[PDB]
Symmetry: D3
Subunit: 29 residues, 6 copies
């Protein structure tokens, strides 16, 4: 299902947004 693929990429985008935030904090640190 492409509908499932779309939803899974949406979740991946959310997780990478969080990863970017955490590395941003580590770097600033």
């Amino acid at each position: 299902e492409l509908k499932a693929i779309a939803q899974e990429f949406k979740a991946i985008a959310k997780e990478f947004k969080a990863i970017a935030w955490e590395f941003k904090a580590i770097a600033q640190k």
Copy 2:
């Protein structure tokens, strides 16, 4: 938090496993 990063990559791995499974099913058909 590195623990947060690790958890988020674990989630990403699980989503890509699902994406691979869906594309495989699409390709099968």
Copy 3:
């Protein structure tokens, strides 16, 4: 290095967000 990694993950997150939207568009065809 970590600052650059944080920015690269931020850009990756935005790109996966766009990919998810494109697949969503194809899914609800």
Copy 4:
């Protein structure tokens, strides 16, 4: 080839599983 895409996403999932495992080990320490 969709079969190639599916195979490549399967490989990606396996690499991110490994990345999650490594970051978890780093965070543990």
Copy 5:
């Protein structure tokens, strides 16, 4: 090991390069 993480991201980059190529061919098609 960050050395392992670096190698795993290098592999991921290679796989996404192939995915991009295959979708480019499907789209052109």
Copy 6:
């Protein structure tokens, strides 16, 4: 849509290539 997806995956591949290089730099510290 597929054309845009192909281009987004191409950009993602390049970004993961850069991330891999940055982690490689941190790894051989």
